[PDB]
Amino acid sequence: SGFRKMAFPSGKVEGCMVQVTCGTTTLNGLWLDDVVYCPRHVICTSEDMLNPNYEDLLIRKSNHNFLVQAGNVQLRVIGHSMQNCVLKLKVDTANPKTPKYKFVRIQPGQTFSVLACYNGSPSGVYQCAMRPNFTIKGSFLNGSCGSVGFNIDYDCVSFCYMHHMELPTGVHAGTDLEGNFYGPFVDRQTAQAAGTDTTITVNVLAWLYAAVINGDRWFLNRFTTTLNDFNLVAMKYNYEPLTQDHVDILGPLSAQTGIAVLDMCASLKELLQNGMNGRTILGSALLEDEFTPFDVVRQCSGVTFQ
Amino acid sequence: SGFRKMAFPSGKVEGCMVQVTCGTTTLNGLWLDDVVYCPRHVICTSEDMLNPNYEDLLIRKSNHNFLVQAGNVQLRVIGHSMQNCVLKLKVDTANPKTPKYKFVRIQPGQTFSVLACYNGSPSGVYQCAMRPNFTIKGSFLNGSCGSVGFNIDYDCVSFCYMHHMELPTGVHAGTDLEGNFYGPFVDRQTAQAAGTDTTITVNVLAWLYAAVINGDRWFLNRFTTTLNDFNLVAMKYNYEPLTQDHVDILGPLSAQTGIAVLDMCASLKELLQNGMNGRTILGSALLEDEFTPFDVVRQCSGVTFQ
Ligand SMILES: C[C@H]([C@@H](O)c1ccc(O)cc1)N1CCC(Cc2ccccc2)CC1
Ligand SMILES: C[C@H]([C@@H](O)c1ccc(O)cc1)N1CCC(Cc2ccccc2)CC1
């Protein structure tokens, strides 16, 4: 029936996006209940970003300096406070479109949808993963900050990312909704370089199962391997080490397809050592690593939401 | 700032999705104003699908046989009629969430977002193109039929696709919202094979411009070409022939980057003749053809919507 990189439907998050302007800076915020969440660097000028002292910059700001606009209607700020790298703007009206939601801090390897916004207005939606180096490979231009990453389970929106910074190398860094950066990144314009971008081995294996379920099977071979043996090969190619937990997580895909996890590892090994010789898998000429096992089961089984 | 395959935000379409059940068949419909649109094969059994006579099958159906459910609320069918391959179910309540919208029949090469649904509930969202052979490469399982494809311009939803059929080869066929199939496909379980899947040359060039704007430039060379010369090469590799209209459409990307369209064609030629030698472009090991020139400008410039 086919396999595609798909995002969660975005409507529940669309209804939470607002525009935050402090002085000459405009970016996005997230309106849940009577609180608007946005990056604290909204209070900075472009100059401030080299060496900002956020507590000091904050002292000069009052409730009325934060202009918050929900589509065409202005929201009244009745309180503000800084939590880590985010600002929480208390407004006098609960967002009537607040969905059921949680704040979750995800682990590397975990996937989520991003609703890219500009001036509190939604631009587009795409799927991302937290890379093992704690960056993400997004699509963000100036004014996109405060765009959020999320997952949905039936009717609950688990928000996991807010966008803050682009590194000189074109990749993206940001926070959870408590304002704590993923990785060692900070909201300052300095020399911060990303570490090694390793491949999320468990996600590649999940995606190979997805290929098999959809008819792409040329890469299945007559071999098997061990975790230890496979991991010697993974390390050489900058792949996350595979653990027994990962094997356990792939158990459902294993069961449905009748290909043992270690046999699929031997398929992956051979693809790493020999390449794809110009062939493709689910329409890709390289090995996709931004589907989780849970992603594969969900799109392959057709789970939906409130 | 990065470049990603992104769909339009899906909320406006989410609010139009309903479930249609006729007998033992459940699939999705689209509720706009006081009309629900759905595939006419909702009236078929699995057996009927080999050789259905839709007019005859329809005679046994009445308004009350169409069960239409909008989330948890039932809609009253007060009229029904068949238009080409779709059924229009007149209900007694206008959808309060009807967005501004149009019905457009797109051309091959044109891109759109699909909101995959199951039982009137949204599952996920992804970007697609009408292939030159009038198929699309989607992600659709049983019960997905009646899922729609759309574009948004600011506040207007232009619906262009409704999903009807999977061909034996794993690709997808469907109609415009007047119920007319794209291509020579029909809503009957028969031997219908897709034609040659040619690459959408104009979209590849657009995406190479996108790469250059984002820092990927290793494939720019010291050469140029002519339309005629380039097209000899395109034909050999099953690429759509490039026309002066295409060149004109790429004019804005040409202008912004200062790479002439024909110079970019010579880059493409070299990539076709020599391959990518294991390198990548915007994170792909093959040449993406499901971004339009207009797509590139939009994500690269940050256009948003009501
Ligand atoms: C593979 C999936 C899904 O259930 C699943 C995915 C991943 C898992 O880890 C577990 C389950 N099922 C869905 C039902 C399909 C029935 C079918 C057969 C032939 C033609 C048309 C339809 C057979 C495959
Ligand atoms: C390329 C895009 C966009 O406008 C566009 C895209 C495709 C077109 O066909 C036409 C225009 N612009 C956006 C503004 C950017 C300003 C900038 C420069 C340096 C650092 C940060 C920001 C420079 C590039």
Closest of A160, A245, A169 to residue A201, by C-alpha: A245
Best of A297, A298, A299, A303 to mutate for ligand 1, by most ligand atoms within 8 A of CB? A297
What are residue B36's DSSP bridge partners?
A: B31, B89
Closest of A181, A91, A70, A92 to residue A135, by C-alpha: A181
Catalytic pick among B41, B80, B163, B172: B41
Of B9, B286, B302, the CB nearest to A285: B286
Torsion region of B108: left, alpha or beta (phi above 0 gives left; psi -120 to 50 gives alpha): beta
Ligand 2 atom closest to residue B297's alpha carbon, by position in its atom list: 7
Contact A116 B144 (CB under 8 A): no
What are residue A149's DSSP bridge partners?
A: A114, A161
Tell me, in angstroms, the distance from the centre of ligand 2 to residue B50's CA: 53
CB-ligand 2 contact for B298 (6 Å cutoff): no
Same domain, A152 and A235: no
Closest of B115, B46, B117, B55 to residue B85, by C-alpha: B55
Same domain, B186 and B214: no
Q: Which residues of chain B are within 8 Å of residue A302 when distances are taken between CB atoms?
A: 118, 123, 141, 143-144
Residue with tokens 């704690």: A134
H or E segment to which residue B251 belongs: helix B251-257
Tell me, in angstroms, the distance from the centre of ligand 2 to residue A165's CA: 17
Same domain, A177 and A269: no
CB proximity list for A86: less than 8 A, separation 6 or greater: A37, A38, A39, A40, A162, A175, A177, A178, A179
Please name the amino acid found at residue B160: C
Q: What does residue B248 show for φ and ψ, rounded to 5 degrees? A: -55, -40
Contact A126 B6 (CB under 8 A): yes
Say which experimental method was used: X-ray
**A20-43: b (≥16 Cβ within 10 Å) or e:** bbbeebbbbbbbbebbbbbbbbbb
Q: What does residue A27 show for φ and ψ, rounded to 5 degrees? A: -150, -170
Same domain, B154 and B25: no
Query: What residue of A is the nearest CA neighbor of B114?
Result: A6
Q: What is the CATH number of the domain that holds B260?
A: 1.10.1840.10
Nearest residue (CA) to ligand 2, atom 19:
A142
CB B225 within 8 A of CB B273: no
Measure the CA–CA gap between B95 and B157, rounded to whole angstroms.
15
Same domain, B166 and B295: no
Last residue of a domain, one of B158, B181, B197: B197
In a domain, B306, yes or no: no
Ligand 2 atom closest to residue B213's alpha carbon, by position in its atom list: 1
Q: What is the bridge-based pairing of β-strands A156-166 and A100-103? A: parallel
Active site residue B117: no
Same domain, B81 and B30: yes
With the CA atoms of B269, B274, B276 and B282 taken in that order, what torsion angle do they form, in degrees rounded to the nearest 10?
0
In a domain, A306, yes or no: no
- State the greatest distance between any 2 C-alpha atoms of chain A, in Å, as a whole number: 69
H or E segment to which residue A122 belongs: strand A121-129
Closest of A14, A25, A54, A45 to residue A147, by C-alpha: A14
Same domain, B149 and B10: yes
Measure the CA–CA gap between B36 and A7, rounded to whole angstroms.
26
**Residue A280: Cβ-neighbour burial (10 angstroms; 0-12, 13-18, 19+):** middle
How many C-beta atoms lie closer than 10 Å to residue B80's C-beta? Answer: 19
In a domain, A26, yes or no: yes
Per DSSP, A215 falls in state T
With the CA atoms of A96, A154, A287 and B9 taken in that order, what torsion angle do they form, in degrees rounded to the nearest 10?
-30
Residue with tokens 């800084």: A82
Expressed in angstroms, the distance from the first to the final Cα of chain B is 24
Nearest residue (CA) to ligand 1, atom 14:
A301
**Where would I find the beta strands (DSSP E) of chain B?**
17-22, 25-32, 35-39, 66-70, 73-75, 77-83, 86-91, 100-103, 111-118, 121-129, 148-153, 156-166, 172-175
Q: What is the bridge-based pairing of β-strands B35-39 and A121-129? A: unpaired
Rg (chain A; Cα; Å): 21
CB proximity list for B120: less than 8 A, separation 6 or greater: B17, B18, B19, B20, B28, B29, B69, B70, B71
CB-ligand 2 contact for B6 (6 Å cutoff): no
Calculate the alpha carbon distances from A57 to A45, A54, A164, B279 in Å: 10, 5, 18, 45
Measure the CA–CA gap between A198 and B38, rounded to whole angstroms.
45
Closest of A145, A139, A153, A140 to residue A179, by C-alpha: A145
CB-ligand 1 contact for A300 (6 Å cutoff): yes
In a domain, A106, yes or no: yes
Q: Which residues of chain A are within 8 Å of residue B11 when distances are taken between CB atoms?
A: 9-12, 14-15, 122
Measure the CA–CA gap between A291 and A37, rounded to whole angstroms.
28
Tell me, in angstroms, the distance from the centre of ligand 2 to residue A118's CA: 14
Q: How many domains in chain A? A: 3
CB-ligand 2 contact for B247 (6 Å cutoff): no
CB proximity list for B13: less than 8 A, separation 6 or greater: B99, B115, B148, B150, B157
Q: What is the CATH number of the domain that holds B62?
A: 2.40.10.10
Measure the CA–CA gap between A122 and A143, rounded to whole angstroms.
12
Last residue of a domain, one of A44, A74, A99: A99
Same domain, B188 and B282: no
Q: Which residues of chain B are within 8 Å of residue A301 when distances are taken between CB atoms?
A: 141
Instruction: Using alpha carbons only, give the angle A280, A284, A287 rounded to the nearest 5 degrees.
Output: 95
CB-ligand 2 contact for B7 (6 Å cutoff): no
Measure the CA–CA gap between B127 and B6, rounded to whole angstroms.
6
Q: Which domain holds residue B82?
A: 15-99
CB-ligand 2 contact for B67 (6 Å cutoff): no
Same domain, A104 and A193: yes
Residue with tokens 């070409």: B225
Q: In a 3-state reduction of DSSP, which class is residue B2?
A: coil
Q: Name the residues of A annotated as catalytic.
A: 41, 145
CB-ligand 1 contact for A214 (6 Å cutoff): no
Contact B2 A117 (CB under 8 A): no
Q: What is the bridge-based pairing of β-strands B17-22 and A172-175? A: unpaired
Q: What does residue B112 show for φ and ψ, rounded to 5 degrees? A: -165, 165
Last residue of a domain, one of B160, B180, B197: B197
**A200-234: b (≥16 Cβ within 10 Å) or e:** bbbbbbbbbbbbbbbebeebbeeebbebeebbebb
Contact B139 A166 (CB under 8 A): no
Q: In what order do the strands lie in the sheet with B25-32?
A: B73-75, B66-70, B17-22, B25-32, B35-39, B86-91, B77-83
Contact B126 A14 (CB under 8 A): no
Documented resolution in Å = 1.7
Same domain, A207 and A117: no
Of B2, B10, B285, the CB nearest to A139: B2
Q: Which residues of chain A are within 8 Å of residue B304 when distances are taken between CB atoms?
A: 117-119, 121-123
Same domain, B9 and B126: yes
Of B122, B139, B304, the CB nearest to A305: B122
CB-ligand 1 contact for A252 (6 Å cutoff): yes
- Closest-CA distance, A60 to chain B, in angstroms, reads 31
Contact A166 B118 (CB under 8 A): no
Same domain, B5 and B74: no
Ligand 2 atom closest to residue B296's alpha carbon, by position in its atom list: 7
- Closest-CA distance, B124 to chain A, in angstroms, reads 5
Contact A11 B14 (CB under 8 A): yes
Would you say the C-alpha torsion B207, B212, B215, B216 has a positive or negative sign? positive
